Design a protein around this motif. Structure first.
Motif, mmCIF file in Angstrom:
data_model
loop_
_atom_site.group_PDB
_atom_site.id
_atom_site.type_symbol
_atom_site.label_atom_id
_atom_site.label_comp_id
_atom_site.label_asym_id
_atom_site.label_seq_id
_atom_site.Cartn_x
_atom_site.Cartn_y
_atom_site.Cartn_z
ATOM 1 N N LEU A 1 0.828 -1.202 0.000
ATOM 2 C CA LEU A 1 0.000 0.000 0.000
ATOM 3 C C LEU A 1 0.865 1.256 0.000
ATOM 4 O O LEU A 1 0.441 2.314 -0.466
ATOM 5 C CB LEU A 1 -0.927 0.005 1.216
ATOM 6 C CG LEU A 1 -1.758 -1.259 1.433
ATOM 7 C CD1 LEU A 1 -2.527 -1.176 2.743
ATOM 8 C CD2 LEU A 1 -2.711 -1.478 0.266
ATOM 9 N N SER A 2 2.080 1.132 0.523
ATOM 10 C CA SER A 2 3.006 2.258 0.585
ATOM 11 C C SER A 2 3.025 3.017 -0.738
ATOM 12 O O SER A 2 3.111 4.245 -0.760
ATOM 13 C CB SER A 2 4.414 1.769 0.927
ATOM 14 O OG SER A 2 4.490 1.334 2.274
ATOM 15 N N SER A 3 2.946 2.278 -1.839
ATOM 16 C CA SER A 3 2.958 2.880 -3.167
ATOM 17 C C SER A 3 1.709 2.492 -3.952
ATOM 18 O O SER A 3 1.763 2.283 -5.163
ATOM 19 C CB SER A 3 4.210 2.447 -3.934
ATOM 20 O OG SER A 3 5.298 3.314 -3.663
ATOM 21 N N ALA A 4 0.583 2.399 -3.250
ATOM 22 C CA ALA A 4 -0.681 2.039 -3.880
ATOM 23 C C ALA A 4 -1.684 3.184 -3.790
ATOM 24 O O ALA A 4 -1.739 3.898 -2.790
ATOM 25 C CB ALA A 4 -1.252 0.783 -3.238
ATOM 26 N N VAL A 5 -2.477 3.353 -4.845
ATOM 27 C CA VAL A 5 -3.480 4.411 -4.884
ATOM 28 C C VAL A 5 -4.881 3.834 -5.047
ATOM 29 O O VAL A 5 -5.190 3.199 -6.056
ATOM 30 C CB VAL A 5 -3.206 5.400 -6.034
ATOM 31 C CG1 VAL A 5 -2.648 4.668 -7.246
ATOM 32 C CG2 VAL A 5 -4.474 6.158 -6.396
ATOM 33 N N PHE A 6 -5.728 4.060 -4.047
ATOM 34 C CA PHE A 6 -7.099 3.563 -4.079
ATOM 35 C C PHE A 6 -8.013 4.536 -4.817
ATOM 36 O O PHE A 6 -7.954 5.746 -4.601
ATOM 37 C CB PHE A 6 -7.615 3.339 -2.656
ATOM 38 C CG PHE A 6 -6.532 3.001 -1.672
ATOM 39 C CD1 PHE A 6 -5.777 1.849 -1.821
ATOM 40 C CD2 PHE A 6 -6.269 3.835 -0.596
ATOM 41 C CE1 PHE A 6 -4.780 1.534 -0.917
ATOM 42 C CE2 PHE A 6 -5.273 3.526 0.311
ATOM 43 C CZ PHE A 6 -4.528 2.374 0.150
ATOM 44 N N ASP A 7 -8.858 3.998 -5.689
ATOM 45 C CA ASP A 7 -9.787 4.817 -6.460
ATOM 46 C C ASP A 7 -11.182 4.199 -6.464
ATOM 47 O O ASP A 7 -11.356 3.032 -6.110
ATOM 48 C CB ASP A 7 -9.284 4.982 -7.895
ATOM 49 C CG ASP A 7 -10.099 5.991 -8.681
ATOM 50 O OD1 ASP A 7 -10.297 7.115 -8.176
ATOM 51 O OD2 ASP A 7 -10.539 5.655 -9.801
ATOM 52 N N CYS A 8 -12.171 4.988 -6.866
ATOM 53 C CA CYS A 8 -13.551 4.520 -6.915
ATOM 54 C C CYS A 8 -14.019 4.354 -8.358
ATOM 55 O O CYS A 8 -13.742 5.195 -9.212
ATOM 56 C CB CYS A 8 -14.469 5.496 -6.178
ATOM 57 S SG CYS A 8 -14.586 7.126 -6.950
ATOM 58 N N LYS A 9 -14.727 3.261 -8.623
ATOM 59 C CA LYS A 9 -15.233 2.983 -9.961
ATOM 60 C C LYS A 9 -16.367 3.937 -10.324
ATOM 61 O O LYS A 9 -16.822 4.721 -9.491
ATOM 62 C CB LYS A 9 -15.721 1.535 -10.054
ATOM 63 C CG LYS A 9 -14.648 0.560 -10.504
ATOM 64 C CD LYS A 9 -14.523 0.529 -12.019
ATOM 65 C CE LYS A 9 -13.712 1.708 -12.536
ATOM 66 N NZ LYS A 9 -13.140 1.438 -13.883
ATOM 67 N N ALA A 10 -16.821 3.864 -11.571
ATOM 68 C CA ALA A 10 -17.904 4.718 -12.041
ATOM 69 C C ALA A 10 -19.216 4.376 -11.345
ATOM 70 O O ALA A 10 -20.015 5.259 -11.037
ATOM 71 C CB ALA A 10 -18.057 4.593 -13.550
ATOM 72 N N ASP A 11 -19.431 3.088 -11.099
ATOM 73 C CA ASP A 11 -20.647 2.628 -10.438
ATOM 74 C C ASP A 11 -20.436 2.516 -8.932
ATOM 75 O O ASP A 11 -20.962 1.608 -8.287
ATOM 76 C CB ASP A 11 -21.083 1.278 -11.007
ATOM 77 C CG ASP A 11 -21.967 1.423 -12.230
ATOM 78 O OD1 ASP A 11 -21.423 1.498 -13.351
ATOM 79 O OD2 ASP A 11 -23.205 1.460 -12.065
ATOM 80 N N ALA A 12 -19.664 3.443 -8.375
ATOM 81 C CA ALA A 12 -19.385 3.449 -6.945
ATOM 82 C C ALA A 12 -20.677 3.434 -6.133
ATOM 83 O O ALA A 12 -20.679 3.063 -4.960
ATOM 84 C CB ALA A 12 -18.541 4.660 -6.576
ATOM 85 N N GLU A 13 -21.772 3.842 -6.767
ATOM 86 C CA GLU A 13 -23.070 3.876 -6.102
ATOM 87 C C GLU A 13 -23.314 2.590 -5.319
ATOM 88 O O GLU A 13 -24.082 2.573 -4.357
ATOM 89 C CB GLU A 13 -24.187 4.082 -7.126
ATOM 90 C CG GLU A 13 -24.200 3.042 -8.232
ATOM 91 C CD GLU A 13 -25.063 3.451 -9.410
ATOM 92 O OE1 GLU A 13 -24.806 4.529 -9.985
ATOM 93 O OE2 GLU A 13 -25.994 2.695 -9.754
ATOM 94 N N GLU A 14 -22.655 1.515 -5.738
ATOM 95 C CA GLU A 14 -22.802 0.222 -5.077
ATOM 96 C C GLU A 14 -21.688 0.005 -4.055
ATOM 97 O O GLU A 14 -21.847 -0.757 -3.102
ATOM 98 C CB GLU A 14 -22.791 -0.907 -6.108
ATOM 99 C CG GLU A 14 -22.389 -2.255 -5.531
ATOM 100 C CD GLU A 14 -22.934 -3.419 -6.334
ATOM 101 O OE1 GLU A 14 -24.092 -3.816 -6.092
ATOM 102 O OE2 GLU A 14 -22.200 -3.934 -7.205
ATOM 103 N N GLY A 15 -20.562 0.680 -4.264
ATOM 104 C CA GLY A 15 -19.438 0.546 -3.355
ATOM 105 C C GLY A 15 -18.282 -0.216 -3.970
ATOM 106 O O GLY A 15 -17.833 -1.224 -3.424
#
Length: 119
Positions: free
Chosen positions: A57-71
């Motif tokens: 995770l030290s060099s990881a980037v978390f992002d949200c999908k287009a349908d994040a509406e679901e999570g």
């Protein structure tokens, strides 16, 4: 300072999308963070002490999908881009925020130990 209960590690069951397999789809996989190598390890189940794989995770980037509406979210890393989704839209938020704490912290941490600590 601190109170309540000790051992508030970061763990939870997530769903991995088609990846490194014959077919595509979501699969119930057990994910758990490690406070030893500062990496995110995950296995088939919580009973499988042996972690299937790990993601720095030290060099990881978390992002949200287009349908994040679901999570849904995705962890972009210089090794392999993973795609995991949470229960609901509010679920992932917890993972994204928390997951950061671990990484972000490391960045905040002070320089080499044995400082001057004078004055």
């Amino acid at each position: 300072g601190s109170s309540g209960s000790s051992g508030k590690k970061l763990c939870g069951y997530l769903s991995k999308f088609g990846g490194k397999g014959p077919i595509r789809g979501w699969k119930s996989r057990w994910f758990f963070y490690d406070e030893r190598k500062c990496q995110l390890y995950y296995s088939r189940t919580a009973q499988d002490a042996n972690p299937l794989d790990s993601i720095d995770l030290s060099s990881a980037v978390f992002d949200c999908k287009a349908d994040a509406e679901e999570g849904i979210f995705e962890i972009k890393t210089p090794s392999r881009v993973i795609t995991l989704k949470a229960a609901t839209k509010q679920a992932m938020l917890y993972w994204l925020q928390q997951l950061q704490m671990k990484r972000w912290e490391f960045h905040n941490s002070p320089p080499a130990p044995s400082g001057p600590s004078s004055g």
